[PDB]
């Protein structure tokens, strides 16, 4: 729970959006909260612990989010005179000789009667748009990428990245000093979070520990068994199970790398999205078909190809309206062919544009 990773190396740089992939995950969330204690206690700022699904918060132990050892390791000699009423979910401790009290109730934690941690779930985000979060400096999004191994039939929230963005706007209103931590235990492409960030995961970027971008940073953290305690029976038992053993280093086991190929012929359909036109080209082969997902900056040269439009406002003239029932009829297989890695992309740059488009309109 006190791993070698710390967010100090990230807080010192000038960036404010961090994507941390890899690690125990149990240690990551623990150390992020600990490094934030000082600000939360004495700088009049709060924290928001965000999970995707409300079920993930109800089962979360709040009383144990801030724990005795958490304070001992992050305050040391400053800390003494600790007593707590776990039944009533209260802590009584002293820092620098001053007496403080932390109470945990419902989805909030208070420090001297000031909320310092909010527990809210993205699937319930529509409820929390009420701006009761005046001074939130840290937003922590934990387990932000689904591990298909852990939970095969798990779905992201509909239009998740827009929901998340709406929530940031609500939590952070005209605040310069705001930080967002996106903690993931596994790294892979083909998910709305990566697409929203516009990040394409590549082993070259993983071999390098750090990746800097205009709007955010990405940090990859390595786990290594190093020395194993083969005197402990529980440790020995785990070594005998391959599946459990691999789970320790399963972060980058399979990054989802698409296939890339170019096709000269013109596309069969076009859809206008983000002041561009996405295109799908089909090439007939004896076995069946080959799909090419393309991007065109202008309609010059592809005069009489049909153009679908998601938005009614940007609709015009010869474009056909993209209603939700007409879209399910025409794009379901194309989305399936995409989510399953069955198509050729022009380049990683086009792949991200298609990812944004797919995850915006995908239906569930």
């Amino acid at each position: 729970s006190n791993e070698f990773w710390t967010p100090k190396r990230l807080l010192e740089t000038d960036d404010r959006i961090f994507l941390v992939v890899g690690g125990r995950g149990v240690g990551k969330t623990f150390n992020v909260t600990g490094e934030a204690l000082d600000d939360l206690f004495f700088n009049n700022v709060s924290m928001v612990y965000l999970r995707r699904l409300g079920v993930e918060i109800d089962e979360l132990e709040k009383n144990n989010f801030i724990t005795e050892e958490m304070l001992r390791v992050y305050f040391g000699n400053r800390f003494s005179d600790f007593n707590a009423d776990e039944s009533k979910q209260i802590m009584r401790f002293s820092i620098d000789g001053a007496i403080h009290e932390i109470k945990a109730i419902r989805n909030k934690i208070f420090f001297d009667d000031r909320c310092i941690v909010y527990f809210i779930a993205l699937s319930r985000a529509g409820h929390v748009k009420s701006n009761n979060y005046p001074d939130v400096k840290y937003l922590v999004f934990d387990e932000v990428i689904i591990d298909r191994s852990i939970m095969p039939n798990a779905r992201y929230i509909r239009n998740e990245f827009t929901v998340l963005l709406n929530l940031i706007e609500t939590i952070k209103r005209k605040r310069e000093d705001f930080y967002l931590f996106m903690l993931s235990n596994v790294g892979e492409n083909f998910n709305p979070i990566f697409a929203g960030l516009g990040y394409y995961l590549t082993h070259e970027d993983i071999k390098k520990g750090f990746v800097k971008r205009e709007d955010y940073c990405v940090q990859f953290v390595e786990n290594k068994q190093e020395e194993l305690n083969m005197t402990d029976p529980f440790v020995r038992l785990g070594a005998k199970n391959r599946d459990f053993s691999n789970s320790k280093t399963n972060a980058f086991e399979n990054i989802r790398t698409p296939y890339f190929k170019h096709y000269g012929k013109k596309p069969k359909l076009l859809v206008k999205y983000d002041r561009q036109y996405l295109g799908i080209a089909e090439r007939k082969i004896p076995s069946g078909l080959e799909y090419y997902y393309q991007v065109y900056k202008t309609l010059d040269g592809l005069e009489n190809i049909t153009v679908f439009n998601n938005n009614f406002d940007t609709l015009m003239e010869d474009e056909v309206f993209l209603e939700e029932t007409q879209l399910k009829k025409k794009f379901k297989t194309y989305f399936e062919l995409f989510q399953q890695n069955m198509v050729y992309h022009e380049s990683p740059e086009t792949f991200l544009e298609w990812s944004k488009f797919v995850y915006a309109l995908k239906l569930e």
Copy 2:
């Protein structure tokens, strides 16, 4: 600073029924509740927060309905000595030197041990027809128009507007001083609320902020194209995603405007409704048929055309009784052809009469 829109301009006018469409939506509900606090506290009146579906009430946290920050902007200097016991679901504070207590338990909110807000759902209203709500001056109907995007499956209540009217009568019993607020974050036609009000949504009425009527007022609020701080990473991140950006202006993205056309031939069938006769005319074309939805003031000229009657009491011996099985046999397809915009209406005036009728008798 403070939100541009205010309900003061509406409370000053002589109308008592307000339909506010567009915006973030919480700011609407947030600001309406705040302006009412004064009456709720000192003039012995209560409030009712109405949602369509019981699910919309259960997931709502009643403690965040009235919040400190809300009390801050709506009382300024009169409010101080605020203390809150989240453990007991209590808020304590001092106003004008008087100490008050706000408690939320059993889906109710109290002020000095007097209920000031009731949370009840329209889908359960038929059972509580005998239930009473002694001193309610404000009725707030939130999210009164379904945003099909936000929710996968959401249905209006069968005969919703009549259920709503029935609830109004129960809540408001011979009170000359009563107010009704209907808040919508998205505006579109083909819904029972607009049909009940007899309002036809048009882009022309949106360019104008306000629309006065005899029985109610409609005010449209659009988000204000604020300057974006592109130095902020979060703002740049949002700018790179069009779905999130488009969501800011999706309130009036697509109002459902039907098609209008006249047909000289006589109708196939007639139904007597509201001292008038609604008619459907079918015109044969090579491709198939095209439908015309008409209204006739009198039977002059239409002698032997069949006439359906919803009401047994007003029935005549040559009219056919419109029982729940006979209308499924004959009018179900016409209702689908209506809900989907595949028919021609004589005019918006007749469209609203057909809308009222459809939403009155249509089934699921």
Copy 3:
């Protein structure tokens, strides 16, 4: 909002010597309100209790109990006598003064108490089978509200299987050798083809409605008609409602359609017989080119109908050649006939026989 005629009161019914009252029509809030109000005096000071009965348990759970007895209620039925009212709504406690004595009304766990004495029980007809051994010591008032299903409000709401027999069992349990007992059945709509009317043996007819009151040996029936003569057209809510016919029709929809059956006599003998209530009910089918037309008949004795099949609901009374009407044999041979009854598709000999058939159908009907 405003309906232009006086509200209903049980004063005219308590004056007569009868004890079973069926009140049909009205808004409904005023009825239950005034029934409770007229009973408060007894409930408070004569050591008797009340039972508010609903068909479905959800109708009771969804009920707001603390608002059942309200400030303005005690004010109209005690007037000057009432004073010093203050209440802690959060704790569901009413404290008030009557004739200078301080009383306290508390509502907890689906009960209402007056000075620490239960005066109202909220019990649901659908849970009555579980309350066999329950004890209700001093109950003088039993109120059965919304006793007739309104097909408009509730699309596919169903009566309880053998409902009227369930209700009688509840009356006996609540009423244990008590001369002084009252039962109020209140309905917002009046129509035939329901177990309550069938159990009472009452046949609703417009003839009976023009007349306000009906006196029967075991009960009285009173009809109340809303009169929307004068309207406050200054109020927008009134105008908003007036422009919507559906809401407007709903105000007077109580007697919109009483379910009036068809009556016809057919001389030929029946296709089957069933022994019920010391009689023989018969169904006769007459062939017509379009199909068939059904006649539901009543026979006092088998003279003339020797070899016609006879179903018997009761195993004990079963004799010789009669066929026992067990629940699977009844589904095969009476499901369609019961459907034919509930839908108004058959000819009855007379209103007298129709009620005899109603008792039978709702007694054995299945769901």
Copy 4:
């Protein structure tokens, strides 16, 4: 005032398991509790009121289980000074000049702060496995037999009689002074309770009031003497309804009497159960088949007939293991043919053997 049935005639005999069939049901539980009050109050013993389903206990009014007018008939002039707070579920009264208090909370009743009645449901027996019942002398099982007329679709607990035995063992731990009252409003065969007791209901035993067996007694009671008053409108209303009226005496309307016939031919299959052999023989008739359910104590004479075994542990040699799916494949129809009275049994003695076997393995 005095109810006519009493358990005194049963407590004086040397037996300890009593099955009382018939009556209102209200008087039975009322009178059993009354005869037990003395022991419950002054001999430091408790009672357990058992119902099949938790639904039957939650809806039960506990405070009214012991009532004032019950204390008067079973204590008379000694009972006095009665005062009760129904709101707080307290009864305070005097017996022999001593002040006592009865308090009812949740699902327990106390006498002078000593639990005298436990209300527990057979469907929750797994929850009470922890033995908190030191001094329980009375166990009362009410409405122990399903009345198919009152409740058509009501089910017994899976392997109910074994569950009951497990509960008896938990409540009674080697205690010798223990009494069990099984009270039923209906008498009929083909139920797990009768099968467990090994009692076969016969009109011959009903004409006789009492029946005495090694492990239990059965007493059949007809309904109280008092003839109904026709001065009361409610009585006439009930008198005019056939179903309600017969329902008063429907206890022995249809005891399910099986058919008995002997068949000389040997069985088609055998199943070993309880060191016995149950067999089913099929006799061909032109119309179809005739089934004979027989019992064989030894395989002498039926050498090469198959033998199914429910239990793997007792399995030997040529017997075939009876998995739960293979038995549903082969014994399901035979069980259906049994529960419906479609088969011939050698005798009532063998009928009970099949009842035990069927109800032991019968499935939902």
Copy 5:
């Protein structure tokens, strides 16, 4: 009959092993006595316990106020225990130990001792949702009814990849701790389950006749209810004796252990899957009646050059091996897994049987 409290983990806590699998018995006594022997530590050594059940349904319906009972306190503290009084309204037990007053209250699926959490009630089916949860001082982890008894509930499935889920939970509860004990209690013992496969334990009647089986990583103890002579003068005892089902139910723990069939087949396999530094193979032998299947294990690919090889793991994927994604396995392994759970196939030996168990329960779907 009484509790049957003969069984205790005291003789087990003295041995050096820390993982105990106790199978068979009344079921109440197992959980009852484990909790009782641990009470002393829970009250006075500032450590807590975690009561683990497979399905959330088993905990919600569970009554927490009965977990620690009056009898338990007296039996594991004796005359050292006194002045017991309880408040049913609040469900608070107040008792005295050594003259000291303590109070046990249970709220929010937790039990507290002097306002300190001593027992957590958490369900394995929800453990995946909160991997990051903290449980500060847990010394005991008790997994009750860890083997599904098809009798207790007709329809019930093990969790997908359960043993990996459990280990992750073990790791979460036990951080920075060497003194930790894990109790797995089962009321029925049978093969073909993920817990046994994870432990690598193969149940055999030889191991049952002996009460105890010491293994390197865990201990297994089999408990048999003690034959208390029946009082055949008591009517209730006779009534129970006449119901074979009630009587047999007491000794039903090891009624049918699922023993697989073992046979060797000389031909080469049809398919191979690389798992745990080895190669699992399936060979089909044609017989007149139909087919008979052989589940094999090969230490090396020497000799089976052009046979197909599936690989669950992408990182180690090579050359001609085909990726075993969750949809590709349904097309080719669904029937073989069904044929495995039903004992319709031949295994080389119990050692290989467990390797297939690990593999099947790791990739099996529900």
